[PDB]
Structure 1
């Protein structure tokens, strides 16, 4: 034994006598053996203040001796190029190492090697972090982290060994990692390395989804060059033979649902094994057992292979598992966004039965808002309950507001300067506000918005615009006029289905025309409005105050957002003038894309586009010439100039304030004002009908490694505009512009990929059937107009 009269200290500096005592098990007066002293030492270490401790028996007095860890007095850097002194400083406080705390001296070489892996992720494998610790007069240390990051390492080959039915290139075609990028070009992934897991996953699926049921990735080695600048990658594989599916035998805790699972597993006998149909099945089961209360259904499938007839008998093991209940759903980190802002994206109902999906579905539904940097789930069993859980979503909040600027460069547009500012989550309420402007050759647009994405709990949005558009028609390749409009719309957005939406909203427009060079059509509209300005000059003005009911319906079941290979897109907009407007018209436009692949690999898609437009007046009035439908250039019928299809200007004789120098003029007094002049200036119509037929094929001269990056097609475009209120009789001499059987057809070849200057799209069309006064334009393009 041994009895202690006092506890006495040597080496306490920062740690108060009181803090030492409140962590020693052995008290003043206690009876202690060398075992309870070894427990005290053991304990004072567990505090984290001390570097060495020793408790010693000194007669009647227990004596505690300490050397405290040195206080961090500065953290300089000196060497860090690729990581800023602030981003590292913050990451070090997250690891305990900060200024004013004490240095974990045995973790210095840990701190060093701890930072190497930050550098090995990007590929800086030549890197290095030393740490110079300099003692200072009063038990302080100066931590200086000397970096020497190196040449980032680039991947010089991705090889595949055993590939017999597919050239090593076709396979690599689909990997996020690339053995070569091109320039002068395709924006086509980098050339660095990390997390190759998930690229072997696509290699499995390429093989499994073609009936190679016995396919196996034997090994995947990952090499360096001695200089640690180059990186090689081999994935050695074994190709199965092709196996046809025989049947599916289901076996496990089906929770007595064999009735409904025995047809979810019914597969037409003969078709090849299909690694995704398998995981669909597996998911359909987990989605059925989930429909019936079970949170975590497991489902596995090990094919019974039979090399005799070359078939696979899929043995699916079901196991519905247990049933849990959600006591609460809780949110942590939503320090700005309202509780409701996250909770409304929950497909998991709180105070109801757990879904292993609806919790994951409600996480994908959360980061796709993009209000949060990270989104982690955590399902905790409620203490004192075998089947109650809390679902916690730990969010880290992202800076939502941003300034954006984008130059694109298209023909039928010129140079687009899209630019504006946006706040995606106004003070954390899901409300979006922003001021976007786009500036064309013909247009200067500038609108301010306020949107509620959940006006109604089910997803109905109420979005208000407030716009300003100055249109200069003679830059838009139309008859010369100037519309200077502005107004405001409120618009309900109804979500209907995963593929469908409705818009309906009211609108105000102030159209303020001026500088209208006289022509027949433009002027037939004007008598209708009760305005009779001058046939023989260009100094005019029309103020129009319109009130509109707008409505729209959009349907998108495209397989892929980028290069669609399957499914249709259908947008339908229409408006009408609510009684009390200066104008009185209804407008209805409708576009249509339809992709239809012809091969299994889906590199022979057939694109069928159609565009439709129609409107007219109601009270003996007409559709404003500015609400007209045009058809030419890239967006519509290629081979032809922008807007060049349909009716043309039949011009009055006049003079403008131009002061006729030495330029070309249309039906000017200055040059011989007879009566009316026919022109090849276009005005479009109140009745468009364009409809294309593109044949998307492989791109046949470029390396297979990235041939699927570029998309050639062969299009046959045709279109028609016409003027319905054209008096064909009164103007017997001038061409019949109420006749729509004037089908303008063209045929060309398209190319698009993604260059560094942005998304690209070329066309080259010779118009074979063009009619009287149609301006051709054979090579057209955009560089991501934005």
Structure 2
């Protein structure tokens, strides 16, 4: 039996009945800020409320538009509690603030109007650095860059990264505007140049993205890359690739070159329903990306990857959390050609499988007996020249493959051992990592005395402990791992750390 003042909403209460907070939450979906419920039950919805104005405090650097455009409750319209509550999640997913506090205040001049107030404290966003080196052996070396997610508080994401040295020079410039249109359409792109002394390349790309739902968005765009190779050391996989394109490198002769100009199309799909931008406790994220060639390009291929992660709390306080991380990917050729070798997938390092040296997981190079030369004494890989061997030379020099899968499980725990001014920036986890990288089109029948790189079952495994700390200079991650499953040619590195901003 429901009694009291039900302002035209009697069915809704019978429906929720067949509670203590659901009647209030229900009325909160309409402009009823302060109803009363007593208990069969007698309620009083009260008066309909309107929002007189929305004001902010504590945004000393970010542009006001940055926050106002994220609200779903509009001024001069009736209040809803869900319409306001979504503002906290929307601001938190930006990653710009330490916290979002909210309130509702009564207007002294009338019982039926309120002010809605959001109060935030701005966090450090990115960093600028550079460095130098000189000397009798170092010669001249210089590197520099800057990266920020919120440039001068204006909402643009920018960065510049590059270096100059005696063997390799490069630079990359990237800019993007999450808001080109008032509805959330984003634009952006980058330019890069990378000349490594021989692998010289450069290129550019531009993309567009736009939301299609409250939690989902799409991306697509265009780009171009130039690739100029020379002085390529003979390898079986490299020559297989070259042969597939009509090239005929001379046997055991590194005096060679090849270049292409390739235009491609980019696309992707993103789902993001996370609660927080740093140490999320709920939600999941799915990032599906890929690109295909445009007919008329020198290369013909496609590449697709998928990155996922899920956070699930197992308590009431959101302190004990289970995090699953998975990545898959595959690419291939079109038109009868193989996928270019410089697009191969790699794994190993803090971004994939812990405890292995970067880009060491997977197939290794097999070298031809290169023509004997003046580098045979002590300047080369002995069996890679005629001076050391007359047959196919095995190595531990990882070259990567055409497909991979990596996964881990991390059990996230609090570390209530240090003062809050530190503890709120530190979280730790126990982890188990595994992954595999493998090839296709591997003629293991022709190479019967050599490893068969087509067998994906050779899964590499490790586990260990990691700590993440949101340092004021940029998040850092430190860890130690012990490998359990390793194969011939693998190299371990148990003490590792890197920048924690991915």
Would you say same fold, with TM above 0.5?
A: yes
Q: Is the partner of 1:384 in helix, strand or coil?
A: coil
1:615 maps to which of 331, 343, 348: 331
Question: Cα distance, 1:400 vs. partner?
Answer: 11
Question: For residues 316 and 658 of structure 1, what CA distance do their matches in structure 2 show?
Answer: 96
Question: For residues 317 and 414 of structure 1, what CA distance do their matches in structure 2 show?
Answer: 84
Gap change, CA 1:600 and 1:435, over 3 Å in 2: same
Gap change, CA 1:754 and 1:425, over 3 Å in 2: closer
Question: Cα distance, 1:685 vs. partner?
Answer: 0.3
Gap change, CA 1:647 and 1:391, over 3 Å in 2: closer
Q: Is the partner of 2:275 in helix, strand or coil?
A: coil
Question: Cα distance, 1:775 vs. partner?
Answer: 2.0
Gap change, CA 1:380 and 1:719, over 3 Å in 2: closer
Q: Is the partner of 1:357 in helix, strand or coil?
A: helix
Question: Cα distance, 1:508 vs. partner?
Answer: 1.4
Question: Cα distance, 1:653 vs. partner?
Answer: 2.4
Q: Is the partner of 1:433 in helix, strand or coil?
A: strand
2:164 maps to which of 419, 427, 439: 439
Question: Cα distance, 1:751 vs. partner?
Answer: 4.0
**Alpha-carbon contact 1:605-1:696 (below 8 Å) kept:** yes
Q: Is the partner of 2:136 in helix, strand or coil?
A: coil
**Alpha-carbon contact 1:410-1:785 (below 8 Å) kept:** no
Question: For residues 709 and 263 of structure 1, what CA distance do their matches in structure 2 show?
Answer: 44
Ranked by relative contact order (alpha carbons within 8 Å, sequence separation 6 or more), the top structure is 2
Is 1:290 paired with 2:28?
A: yes
Question: Cα distance, 1:743 vs. partner?
Answer: 2.2
Question: For residues 721 and 752 of structure 1, what CA distance do their matches in structure 2 show?
Answer: 27
**Alpha-carbon contact 2:415-2:423 (below 8 Å) kept:** yes
Gap change, CA 1:345 and 1:774, over 3 Å in 2: closer
| Structure with higher helix content | 1
**Alpha-carbon contact 2:333-2:339 (below 8 Å) kept:** yes
Question: Cα distance, 1:785 vs. partner?
Answer: 6.8
Gap change, CA 1:397 and 1:649, over 3 Å in 2: closer
Gap change, CA 1:752 and 1:567, over 3 Å in 2: same
Q: Is the partner of 1:679 in helix, strand or coil?
A: strand
Question: For residues 603 and 498 of structure 1, what CA distance do their matches in structure 2 show?
Answer: 27
- List runs of 5+ in structure 1 lacking aligned partners: 1-248, 266-279, 302-314, 473-481
Gap change, CA 1:557 and 1:491, over 3 Å in 2: same
Deviations 1:288-342 (A, max 9, x none): 43544557768899xxxxxxxxxxxxx9996544346679999999999999877
Which protein is bigger by CA-based radius of gyration? 1
Partner of 2:312: 596
Gap change, CA 1:441 and 1:711, over 3 Å in 2: farther
Gap change, CA 1:410 and 1:766, over 3 Å in 2: farther
Question: Cα distance, 1:655 vs. partner?
Answer: 5.8
**Alpha-carbon contact 1:295-1:353 (below 8 Å) kept:** no
Question: For residues 137 and 353 of structure 2, what CA distance do their matches in structure 1 show?
Answer: 12
Question: Cα distance, 1:345 vs. partner?
Answer: 4.1
Question: Cα distance, 1:491 vs. partner?
Answer: 1.7
Question: Cα distance, 1:599 vs. partner?
Answer: 5.0
- List runs of 5+ in structure 2 lacking aligned partners: none
Gap change, CA 1:289 and 1:637, over 3 Å in 2: same
Question: Cα distance, 1:780 vs. partner?
Answer: 2.3
**Alpha-carbon contact 2:376-2:385 (below 8 Å) kept:** no
Partner of 1:584: 300
| Structure with higher strand content | 2
**Alpha-carbon contact 1:713-1:751 (below 8 Å) kept:** yes
1:770 maps to which of 469, 478, 486: 486
Aligned residues: 502
Question: Cα distance, 1:603 vs. partner?
Answer: 5.4
Question: Cα distance, 1:550 vs. partner?
Answer: 1.6
**Alpha-carbon contact 1:341-1:429 (below 8 Å) kept:** yes
Deviations 1:663-704 (A, max 9, x none): 452544374351321111111100112222344456699999
